[PDB]
Design a binder for this molecule. Structure first.
Ligand SMILES: *C/C=C1/C(=C/c2[nH]c(/C=C3[NH+]=C(/C=C4\NC(=O)C(C=C)=C4C)C(C)=C\3CCC(=O)O)c(CCC(=O)O)c2C)NC(=O)[C@H]1C
Ligand SMILES: *C/C=C1/C(=C/c2[nH]c(/C=C3[NH+]=C(/C=C4\NC(=O)C(C=C)=C4C)C(C)=C\3CCC(=O)O)c(CCC(=O)O)c2C)NC(=O)[C@H]1C
Lengths: 483, 486
């Protein structure tokens, strides 16, 4: 839906009912650990300041306003414009160090008509270089995820560093963690989509790093709050010193988090996940170290893509070698009920399933954790209704309404008709999804995730549905031996 | 084929006839701008040295040999093993700075049983925002070429190399300079293409795993290892993953003949595949320091990512362009009158759709041309040949090969793309492309460029998959405008 006006333009209260619609990109204020100016793209006339900017740079409130950047930044003003040519993206950032009244770090980016400048204080090197090689030589996605979080924590000294991976449905999961000895084990925890809303996700896809240095600090407004050019909200979406959403700063406080920081991992223009960081006390990470994190953000964006592709390939291999061992016994031997229900074949483990139903020559027969006998009959009745020679679902209760009661033993379904109709068929079953534990916050969020996944099960990997289809073909080929 | 033994084990001469089989990974020697040691994976006993190593570190020839790394590197020896656990890949590299008799930069990697250590002098250099800004520039570049320019430009600004080129491989393993950044007053290599054999198999393969190698002085003498063989196995010490590995003699010739004193190249890898190189040249010898090489290595991988992004974005907007064009064709196809009138209209630009030099149309028994097309009697003979072919779609980069008797009509129409509108090839439509041609600006590039053109004799610009895809979708939609004409 269309986001509401900001609080400073008669906008409504950002409650937990409508926070999907917070204009997080135009808070009209910054964090107090730095300063911020805006200026005309062409003229270089300074138009807005953060109130602290006067004190932070070492000049006076209305002497800066209505002044050329040519004057303020004689060395940088020309080189700045070379780096940020008119009409360039807002994602593009030029950086430089300065001398005043101390050493400052200037970070500039352009929002079409308006230049936006961020000032904050500034000032062995093989930590990154070695980590780069470590990431690359890690054997799988988990191992990569561990090296990432471990490294980031070693570099930053954050209390908690987690790699937070998004799922198809926009829900999150902590797949690796690195924390200080004596802390909550967030590893494994999953959280709903709404905990990181649309506009937040969208913004994190273009601008790949944002932080909250002090979760208790007061925001520093811009003066004037609006851009004199257009009389419009100044978009700070691509500014590191942008004021964090009040609603989120609550979440952080309730976790006892003083400082936060997150780095986007993007794969194929898609927000794959975050390196989320926490400190229980406020902590301003210096610009040169943030830069080091930014490199990892993108080195990881690459290796994530490589390792997932390598992992799926070796997983696909495993299913194909398994599929062969099945077809070996299928051409061979005797009745299928005898052969396929053999533990040596492990026909369950093929589709990492909790239960398995087989019907052959009119008889049905089970293996593993399967619903009560009368229900199994009613299920095979329902299967005969369905078109095609393949069915699947993460939550059977939804697709088969009258089979909602048999969710605990068999929430997930994967079915294949061997011959025609569903007379000769084969059916896998998965339990209702279940995870362990270790209002506003994670304890409530974790519970509301489990509520959303009520009656749902572990979803089927495409390669499992693909190999299941190839098994329909090869197992049809061992019916003339039995007919 | 199986590579020959190295020169130092009675191996044959690496001539230009058999250089595909040079064991480039085991030269048994290093470059003189650094030093090199090998040691036991478990014990840390030093087994081999480069002859200069004694002088370079500040100890004596046979005092180092048969010594623990625990003694030599008390601070590093433990942390080293933590970073390089037994059985880890040879691609994995641990780095650290030292103090002796000066500041050294140690770079270690493991080849299973054997640890290999590289020493070379170091420093802080340059300030640090050059990379950080370049990272953002690459990302915000609008297309592959623009990205390529920013890369080469940046690399040159950082290194001060005389020439920096982004060298992109093609499907057939041939190369092409797609961007260049050189010093004012130099050979314009931009555009030049070179054959596959100029960078052979084992070279390519090695450059896919170890993503950077250099030649600091093209005239310098190699420094051998003593002993040349590994005492463990009595085997060639593989230096493939060592920066100070001695460059192939055969390649150092190539560089000398171009007047290149120093070379350096960084692999760009996309999907486990060697996409291309950032190739650098200096006309005088030039040792690039380790901390600056590291900066180049980051770009090597930032670029590996953006190349993949920008190519995917470029193909997507190109695919869009063909689809909007395809629509404008089908708009006039349902409409109007005879197809010969409609399709041969310049406003439609049925040529430009498939970026073709010539175009043949046949409809209701008559054939009709547009643009640069072979002589009339040949066109008849071509349509005869087309009727032989199965399916409703033909393609080729070099028609002369697939249609032997049509080899003579290569200059006007080397490339072919055909689609039968109805059935058979009675009602059909055929695009033609000229023989591939590029401009100019023994052993070296001048000969290589010419031998590339020789290999591409009778060949044409190949058809983008999306052009062959949209051509197939045009068969369907244009069949749908035949009941209007029948
Ligand atoms: C209904 C609105 C809600 C609010 C929305 C919201 N959230 C963010 C930014 C983040 N929210 C996150 C959620 C988590 N962080 C964690 O550490 C954990 C568990 C350990 C969870 C579930 C995260 C990770 C971020 C990233 C930012 C950061 O880590 O510092 C925003 C936008 C913040 C901004 O950029 O200004 C918004 C609007 N959060 C909710 O949970 C609901 C109630
Ligand atoms: C028959 C053997 C040949 C020899 C093979 C060869 N080449 C290399 C390394 C390279 N060769 C390259 C060829 C070019 N470099 C250029 O700059 C241009 C045009 C401007 C061409 C055509 C390139 C780019 C490399 C990369 C290395 C580098 O740039 O420094 C090796 C192995 C080198 C090593 O790592 O030891 C070998 C064996 N070159 C030939 O042309 C043929 C005759």
């Amino acid at each position: 839906l269309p986001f509401f006006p900001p609080l400073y333009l008669g906008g409504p209260e950002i409650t937990t009912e409508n926070c999907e619609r917070e204009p997080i990109h135009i808070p009209g204020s910054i964090q107090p650990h730095g300063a911020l100016l805006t200026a005309d793209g062409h003229s270089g006339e300074v138009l807005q300041m953060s109130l602290n900017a006067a004190t932070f740079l070492g000049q006076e409130p209305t002497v800066l306003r209505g002044q050329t950047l040519a004057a303020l930044l004689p060395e940088q003003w020309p080189a700045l414009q070379a780096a940020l040519p008119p009409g360039c993206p807002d994602a593009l950032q030029y950086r430089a160090t300065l001398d005043w009244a101390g050493h400052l770090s200037l970070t500039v980016h352009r929002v079409g008509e308006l230049l936006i400048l961020e000032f904050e204080p500034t000032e062995g090197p093989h930590a990154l270089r070695n980590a780069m090689f470590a990431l690359e030589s890690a054997p799988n996605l988990r191992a990569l995820a561990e090296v990432a979080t471990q490294t980031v924590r070693e570099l930053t000294g954050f209390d908690r560093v987690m790699l937070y991976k998004f799922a198809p449905d926009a829900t999150g999961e902590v797949i690796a963690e690195a924390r200080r000895e004596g802390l909550h084990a967030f590893l494994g925890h999953r959280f709903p989509a709404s905990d990181i809303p649309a506009q937040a996700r969208a913004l994190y896809t273009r601008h790949l790093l944002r932080l909250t240095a002090d979760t208790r600090a007061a925001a520093v407004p811009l003066d004037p709050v609006l851009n004199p050019q257009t009389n419009a909200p100044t978009p700070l979406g691509g500014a590191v010193l942008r004021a964090t959403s009040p609603m989120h700063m609550q979440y952080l406080r309730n976790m006892g988090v003083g400082s936060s920081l997150s780095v986007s991992v993007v794969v194929g223009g898609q927000l794959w996940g975050l390196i989320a960081c926490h400190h229980q006390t406020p902590y301003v990470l210096p610009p040169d170290l943030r830069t080091t994190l930014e490199y990892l953000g993108r080195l990881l964006s690459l290796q994530v893509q490589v390792k997932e592709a390598a992992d799926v390939a070796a997983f696909r291999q495993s299913l194909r070698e398994h599929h062969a061992r099945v077809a070996l016994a299928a051409a061979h031997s005797l009745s299928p009920h005898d052969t396929l229900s053999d533990p040596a074949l492990d026909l369950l483990g093929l589709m990492r399933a909790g239960g398995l139903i087989l019907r052959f020559e009119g008889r049905w027969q089970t293996l593993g954790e399967v619903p009560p006998a009368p229900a199994v009959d009613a299920l095979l009745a329902w299967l005969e209704t369905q078109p095609g020679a393949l069915v699947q679902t993460d939550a059977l209760g939804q697709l088969w309404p009258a089979g909602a009661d048999l969710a605990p033993s068999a929430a997930g379904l994967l079915a294949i008709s061997v011959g025609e109709g569903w007379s000769e068929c084969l059916v896998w079953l998965r339990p209702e999804l279940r995870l362990e534990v270790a209002d506003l916050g994670p304890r409530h969020s974790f519970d509301t995730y489990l509520e959303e996944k009520r009656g749902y099960a572990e979803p089927w990997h495409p390669g499992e549905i693909e190999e299941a289809q190839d098994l329909r073909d090869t197992l049809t080929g061992a019916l003339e031996h039995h007919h």
